[PDB]
Each structure stands twice: as structure tokens, then as C-alpha cells.
RNA sequence: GUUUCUCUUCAGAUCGCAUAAAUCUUUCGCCUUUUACUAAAGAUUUCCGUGGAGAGGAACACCAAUUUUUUGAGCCUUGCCUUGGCAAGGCU
């Protein structure tokens, strides 16, 4: 019947580079900001489009005094997607858009040759180094501790 | 190791009030603060009896554990997730 | 005088002597004990005397 | 929700998707941002249990 | 571990009440796993209340039954 | 604090009531929140920043009222500060002509309306420890230090009220008399300001003359509490006042490709760049930033869009800075629809904010000064 | 016990990390007319597939050294208690 699946990941790690041209490689879905489905959601509940979304045929179809507004810098049409009850009016139909996701921060290792876990060159150095050394409540040397005969690191084979 | 539930029971105790009897026959009545795991305890805020009846008032006492033969634990423990 | 960190209905309040007053655009309202009353200019300095 | 999970046995986590126990508003969870601060109580043990 | 936490009780000024109606009281620097004291300016309470004065004293632990604080720690 | 202004209005006049009854209940749900009328009946709401304010809104239409409700364009307050001494001495006398109040103002030396908002000073301590401040750290001197009087608009307000008249000029028995009711238009004054019904900030008032009634009915009171405020409005208005915009601080995670861009972003928003460092461990710079927060308005979606989601920033409150231009050029004209050039800001700022508060276009100076002030203003 | 095939029942679920058509009520548009349409909303069904449970078939198959457990034991004298014993105290 075909059902289910069970790989090994040495399978998966050949197949995912063979369709390697097919995909694409972020990391991160930070990159949809206002290019998702619920900002385009939020651009069909009101009649204003985003510059790259697609369009629609609308769903439909003193307090204003300019002189009082200060019109610093224009309305840019990806503000009331963003903010969709604050910078509009009657947000009916409209959907909250996820706001943030913490960047995945991935170096991809070039070539296998190299060690899994090393300092790859893109990472910024660490300067720190202690200068002003502190010094904390480290015990004295030799003062009565010693482990028993058999305790190793966990994992240490 | 097997440090079984009575032990925990007493460690739970903490910090409330618990009575206290030695085999001489004084009884300790006292707010407790620790308790190790072969029974010392320490005991503040006592008022003891006396074998013969008269009252004390005490700062802070430590009492070794195997001179105990009863403590009387607070009745809310019963509940405890030890039990 | 304004009354210093009291408001209500986020209208700064004003004492006129010993009267509570707000101004809602002109109109004078006096501290009844329980409701504001819309006061007349005269009224208020003959009640503040 | 790790304490949460330790001391509510019948609740657990999805496996694709994280749960926001404290969000518990739809507007809360719809942004992925809290907005409002939500107390918990629980009784969690010590090492010493 | 095994020691007894009796490292807050030092330099303070101890009584000690021990077996067989006993009485000591001391200014106090030891223990060990057992709890054996080494008490320091150590007076021996007799039964008539005729005190003596004493100099430093080892303790057996199993003798203890109490150990109280006559100035706090 | 809470700098960004929106306001509101129903859309049907009739639903009002129930407007108000959400307005009180959002109030209780977000503690900082300040609902506030003003003297033009705009209901106006208070918020700490962009996604604050979104949540608010959202909260008010659907959860409590569920009535349709017009959005006013987002605003921030400003403040009224001085930047130069007094040109003139200037007086006022009480409506009875029985008292003459004279009064200066001058800026407060770069600094110490900082630290009374820190509370690193009180007027609940006594006069020598007070003294011993002021003169250790800011080198007043000790007979000035010792004459303060009280902070404005209130006991941590940024402005302070200092009385440098001699004991040989101005009986300070009698003096004593009238200063409870000195310091309560002090902070009345302060509170409101004359140029746009907006705070002031910064300033130093000294008093250098006082004649006072030796009757109790025509000091005291009613004669001396406007009087005072009028001369505060006279001493601020000659001492050539400026507007003072509130700035955010900005801190933006970008890789390093992306940096560029922020630069960018920044330089059409009058920002100025202040740090740029890596962050040690890992591939992402920090940048910092200050920035003016009316136009701080989208700079997080614009910034997130240029990048390719790269970038995110995070804003919060800072100094105050003062506004180029001057609010009182007569000669300036607002060209309604333009982003108008930075020297006629302040100009523009000041009219507006009248327009929305109802108030005069233009600060008709009679108003606060008497005649012979304007006599010796012609002269 | 693992696979298979068939039947029954419940489906709350990205029943589906995919995405079709039809009917009706309205707002539209080209429009002689009508299908066939357009493109938005709502109420609806049809179709390609699915999961859970159950029934039945078929095919291959260890320490006595103070902190408890290898014991400071045991013996007397006073008061009360009708007696019995209790409160102790003193010993080796």
C-alpha cells in the first residue's frame, strides 16, 4: 500500500542535494514579512494593494482638517498592513500579520574536510579576553577534594 | 541511594513548627531549619518541658539525630507529594 | 486655579475660590454633589463670592 | 511551558508547534508577541525534593 | 554529604547538655563526621553548681543529646 | 513616557456614551494608557510606541464597543523650552495695581533638569543639604541655592522657581506671606506654557522684585495667582523660545551586507548613527541610533523591507531636543500639503498643534503683557 | 505476530503543507436573446483523495567501631498508689 516512510540520514543527505536546483536556500522565514498569505489577506479585506502582491476585484465592489496634520512623511501603503488597526479605518475582515521570528543564525560548512564544530571565519571574533581579572570565589589548590577512582566525563569514550 | 519517604517527610517539615522528645524525657517544641539525613536537626524558638514540668524559653538548639524518639510533624503533610 | 492632578473625563479641572469647575469649550461646569451643573458665567461669581 | 509540562502530566506539547501556555489571547498569539502579563502559580520540587 | 552543619554555631558562645546529666559550656572550634567538639574556655557545671574552669577538651560525639547556643549565632 | 498621540472620533455622534464606556475599560486593561479631553473635544489617547497603540485599538473596537471608530494620524507631544537670557527685564502688576511681580527666566546649565527627574534632589530636604547640591556639583551660589522655592509643574518637574530679591528690597516676612500662592501658578504656568498649551521644560525663574498689599485681601489670592502666571508667560516669551521634539533610541540586528541599507533609511529620517559595532560570536552587527519619533512613523516596516526581513529594530524613549527654526517667524508661510524644509519646522509645529487644540493662530503678546510692558516694548 | 483485501461506524482535524466544478440569492461587465461567462460575497452540494476504531477473509511467519540492626546492660532506696504500679532518685 505505499503508506509510510522510514529513512536513515545518510539517504536523506544525498537526496536533498540532488534537488538542490529546485530549491531555495533560506534559512528563515523572516524574509515574508509582509509578503504572506495573511498580509495579502489584509490587503484583499481592504481595497489597497501591497507594490509586489497580486490584485483583486474589491470585495465591496475639524476632524479632517489637513491643517492640522502634520504630513511628515507619506503613508506608505505597507504601513496599514503592518499596523491594520491603527493607520486605517473600518478593519473589518482584517487579520493580524506574525510580527517577528528570532534570525537562524546557520553557517554553512563549505567543504567536509573540516572539523563539524570549528570558529569558520564568518563569526565574528571574540575580543573578549579578561583584562581587568576577576577574581571570583575559585577554592584554593589542593584544599581536601579529590574525585573517586572511577568518575570520567560522560561521554568520554 | 534508597533514602526512603520517611526522611523526605522530615525534610518537607521544614520550616513549620514540630515537637520534639529525648530519651531523657525533655520535650522541645520549636520552629525548625534544617534537617539532615541521619536526623540532626537544628530547632529555633524553642519552649521546652522539662522531665519534671517546668517551662523554658530557648534561642536556638541543635539536637543529634539518634538522641530522638518521636517528632511530631504537622498534620497538613499528610497531603504531600511524597504520599 | 487648576485642580493639580485630579481630572475628569480627562478634562483638566479648575478651582474658581471654593468652586470645582471644568470648562468643556466655554461652557462652565459646576461641582454638584453628585452631577456637574451647566453654570452661567454670573452665577458662578455670585455662588465663588 | 517546561514547568507547565513537568507538573501537568496530561498536558504536552505538539510536536510542530510550540505551546504558548501564557498566551492566552487570540491577539496575542496571532502576532507571536505577548501582550499582556499572565501570572502562574504552581508547586515545583527542589533538589532536595 | 556527611558532616554535620554545624559550621554556622563556631566562635559563638555554646552550652552543651551531655549523657548522664552532665553539663559543659564553651566557646566552640571543631567538628568532624561524628561530631566530635573541641570546646575552648570550657566550665564544668557540677551538681551543687561549684564551677571549675577547664582547658581545651575533646568531646565523644555519641555523649551529645544537645547542643544550644547561649549567644546567638 | 508615554509620547505617542492618536486621536479618536465615532463615527455616529449618537453612539458617543458608548465610546466613553470603552474608552474607561481599555484604561483599567494597560496600566501607562492616558485617556485625555481637551479644550477642543478631541478624545485623545496615549501610547508608548507603534505595536502598542495597534493593540489598543484593536482592543477598544472589537472586545468592548464594537462600533466604527475614525483614526486621527499619529502625533507626538512636544515641549516648549528657552534657549537664551531674557532680552528684558519684565514685569506685571495685579489687576488692583496694589502689587508688582518682576520675574526672569534662563536655562537650567545642561543638566539639572535631568536629575530632578532622576529624584537625585528633593525639595523635602532640608535647606543646607539642598544648598550643599547645588553648589558642589553645579557651583551655584550658596545664597541662591539656599532660595529655592520649588520644583514646577510638579516636586520632580523639570523647571525650578528661584527667588534673588534682597531682604533690604522686598520685606521677605511679607514675601512669605504670598509665596504658597507664588509657587501654585509657577507650576499652573509651567504646566500649560504660552506658546501651545504644552509643558515647559528646562527653565530657570528668578524673581527680582516683589511689592506686596499690606492688606490681606488684595494679596494673597486672586490677584497674585494669574498675575504670576502672566509674568512667567512674558519672561519665557523675551528669553527666545524654542520647541523641543522628543528623539527615540534605536538599536537594529542586520548582517553585514545589509548595514548600508539602515545607513540609508536613517538619512531620510533626519536620523543621526551613534554606534556600529560586531557583536562578538556571531555573524550580525548591531547599529545604533537616534532618531526624531514624528518621524519614526514605519521606520520599522520600511527598514524590514529594503533588507529583505533581515534587519529588525526595536525603539524606546529618550531625550528631548530642541527643534531647528523658530516658532515665532512671522514671515514663514505652511504650504498645506508639503513636507516643508527643516529651518520652518518649529513655525509649523506650533501653528498646527494651536489649530488642533482650537486655540488663536498667532500669540497675540497684549494679551499677556500691560500697557506701560507694551509701552516699553514699543520703546 | 507482520502484511493484504472487503465490510461497518465516527470524523472534531492544514480530515489534504494539495486544490476542481456545479446550483441558488445578490452586487457587477460585455451584452438583440440564451447557454457558455466575468469576479466578488454568502448559503450550498458534487467530485479526487484521507484519518481513527471494529468485524471477517487471505498470504507468509554486603559492612559487629559513635549516626539506627550485633545493645549502658542490669541492680537497688524514697514518696504516693488499697494492691498492682507510677513519679523519680541513686548506683555499679
Excluded at chain 1, 496634520?69 to 493607520?87: S, V
Excluded at chain 5, 564544668?44 to 551529645?64: C, D, F, K, P, W
Excluded at chain 6, 537664551?84 to 488692583?96: D, G, Q
Aim: glycine letters at 6%; aromatic letters at 8%; a negative charge.
Amino acid at each position: 500500500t505505499y503508506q509510510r516512510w522510514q529513512f536513515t540520514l545518510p539517504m536523506m543527505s544525498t537526496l536533498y542535494r540532488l534537488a538542490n536546483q529546485l530549491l531555495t536556500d533560506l534559512v528563515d522565514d523572516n524574509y515574508f514579512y509582509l509578503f504572506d498569505l495573511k498580509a495579502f489577506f489584509t490587503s484583499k479585506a481592504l481595497n489597497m494593494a501591497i507594490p509586489g502582491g497580486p490584485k483583486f476585484e474589491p470585495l465591496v465592489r475639524e476632524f479632517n482638517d489637513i491643517n492640522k496634520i502634520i504630513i511628515r512623511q507619506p503613508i506608505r501603503t505597507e504601513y496599514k498592513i503592518a499596523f491594520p488597526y491603527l493607520y486605517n479605518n473600518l478593519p473589518h475582515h482584517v487579520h493580524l500579520t506574525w510580527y517577528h521570528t528570532p534570525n537562524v543564525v546557520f553557517i554553512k560548512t563549505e567543504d567536509p574536510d573540516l572539523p563539524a564544530f570549528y570558529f569558520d571565519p564568518l563569526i565574528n571574533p571574540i575580543s573578549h579576553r579578561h583584562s581587568v581579572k576577576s577574581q571570583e570565589p575559585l577554592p584554593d589548590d589542593d584544599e581536601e577534594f579529590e574525585l573517586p577512582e572511577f568518575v570520567e566525563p560522560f561521554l568520554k569514550d | 541511594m534508597s533514602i526512603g519517604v520517611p526522611i523526605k517527610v522530615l525534610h518537607e517539615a521544614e520550616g513549620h513548627i514540630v515537637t520534639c522528645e529525648t530519651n531523657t524525657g525533655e520535650v522541645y517544641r520549636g520552629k525548625l531549619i534544617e534537617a539532615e539525613d541521619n536526623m540532626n536537626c537544628q530547632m529555633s524558638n524553642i519552649t521546652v518541658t522539662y522531665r519534671d514540668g517546668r517551662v523554658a524559653q530557648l534561642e536556638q538548639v541543635y539536637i543529634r539525630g539518634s538522641k530522638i524518639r518521636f517528632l511530631i510533624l504537622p498534620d497538613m503533610l499528610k497531603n504531600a507529594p511524597m504520599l | 486655579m487648576p485642580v493639580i492632578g485630579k481630572r475628569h473625563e480627562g478634562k483638566q479641572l479648575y478651582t474658581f475660590g471654593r468652586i470645582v469647575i471644568y470648562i468643556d469649550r466655554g461652557v462652565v461646569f459646576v461641582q454638584g454633589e453628585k452631577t456637574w451643573v451647566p453654570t452661567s458665567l454670573q452665577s458662578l461669581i455670585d455662588m465663588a463670592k | 511551558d517546561c514547568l507547565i509540562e513537568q507538573t501537568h502530566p496530561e498536558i504536552r506539547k505538539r510536536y510542530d508547534q510550540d505551546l504558548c501556555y501564557t498566551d492566552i489571547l487570540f491577539t496575542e498569539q496571532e502576532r507571536g508577541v505577548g501582550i499582556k502579563s499572565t501570572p502562574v502559580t504552581v508547586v515545583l520540587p527542589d533538589t532536595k525534593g | 554529604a556527611h558532616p554535620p552543619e554545624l559550621k554556622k554555631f563556631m566562635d559563638k558562645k555554646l552550652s552543651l547538655k551531655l549523657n548522664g546529666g552532665r553539663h559543659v559550656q564553651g566557646i566552640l572550634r571543631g567538628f568532624d563526621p561524628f561530631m566530635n567538639l573541641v570546646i575552648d574556655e570550657c566550665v564544668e557545671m557540677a551538681t551543687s553548681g561549684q564551677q571549675n574552669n577547664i582547658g581545651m577538651v575533646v568531646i565523644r560525639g555519641n555523649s551529645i543529646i544537645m547542643l544550644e547556643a547561649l549567644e546567638r549565632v | 513616557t508615554s509620547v505617542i498621540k492618536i486621536a479618536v472620533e465615532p463615527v455616529n455622534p449618537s453612539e458617543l456614551p458608548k465610546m466613553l464606556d470603552g474608552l474607561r475599560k481599555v484604561n483599567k486593561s494597560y496600566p501607562s494608557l492616558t485617556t485625555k479631553v481637551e479644550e477642543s473635544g478631541e478624545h485623545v489617547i496615549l501610547g508608548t510606541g507603534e505595536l502598542y497603540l495597534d493593540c489598543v485599538m484593536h482592543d477598544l473596537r472589537k472586545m468592548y464597543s464594537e462600533i466604527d471608530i475614525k483614526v486621527a494620524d499619529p502625533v507626538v507631544t512636544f515641549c516648549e523650552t528657552v534657549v537664551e537670557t531674557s532680552s528684558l527685564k519684565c514685569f506685571a502688576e495685579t489687576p488692583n495695581k496694589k502689587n508688582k511681580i518682576t520675574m526672569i527666566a534662563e536655562p537650567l546649565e545642561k543638566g539639572l533638569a535631568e536629575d530632578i527627574e532622576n529624584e537625585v534632589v528633593q525639595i523635602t530636604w532640608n535647606r543646607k543639604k539642598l544648598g550643599e547640591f547645588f553648589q558642589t556639583k553645579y557651583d551655584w551660589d550658596l545664597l541662591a541655592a539656599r532660595s529655592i522655592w520649588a520644583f514646577g509643574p510638579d516636586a520632580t518637574g523639570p523647571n525650578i522657581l528661584v527667588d534673588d530679591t534682597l531682604p533690604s528690597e522686598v520685606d521677605k516676612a511679607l514675601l512669605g506671606s504670598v509665596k504658597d500662592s507664588i509657587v501654585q501658578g509657577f507650576q499652573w504656568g509651567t504646566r500649560e506654557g504660552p506658546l501651545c498649551d504644552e509643558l515647559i521644560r528646562n527653565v530657570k525663574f528668578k524673581i527680582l522684585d516683589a511689592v506686596v498689599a499690606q492688606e490681606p485681601l488684595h494679596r494673597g489670592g486672586g490677584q497674585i495667582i494669574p498675575t504670576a502666571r502672566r509674568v512667567v508667560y512674558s519672561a519665557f516669551l523675551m528669553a527666545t523660545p524654542r520647541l523641543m521634539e522628543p528623539y527615540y533610541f534605536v538599536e537594529v540586528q542586520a548582517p553585514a551586507d545589509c548595514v548600508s541599507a539602515v545607513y540609508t533609511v536613517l538619512a531620510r529620517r533626519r536620523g543621526h548613527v551613534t554606534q556600529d559595532a560586531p557583536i562578538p560570536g556571531s555573524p550580525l552587527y548591531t547599529i545604533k541610533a537616534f532618531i526624531p519619533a514624528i518621524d519614526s512613523f514605519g521606520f520599522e516596516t520600511d527598514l524590514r523591507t529594503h533588507t529583505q526581513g533581515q534587519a529588525f529594530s526595536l525603539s524606546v524613549f529618550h531625550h528631548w531636543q530642541i527643534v531647528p527654526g523658530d516658532p515665532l517667524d512671522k514671515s514663514i508661510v505652511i504650504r498645506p500639503l508639503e513636507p516643508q524644509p527643516a529651518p520652518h519646522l518649529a513655525r509649523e509645529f506650533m501653528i498646527k498643534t494651536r489649530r488642533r487644540k482650537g486655540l488663536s493662530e498667532d500669540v497675540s503678546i497684549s494679551k499677556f503683557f500691560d500697557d506701560p510692558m507694551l509701552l516699553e516694548l514699543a520703546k
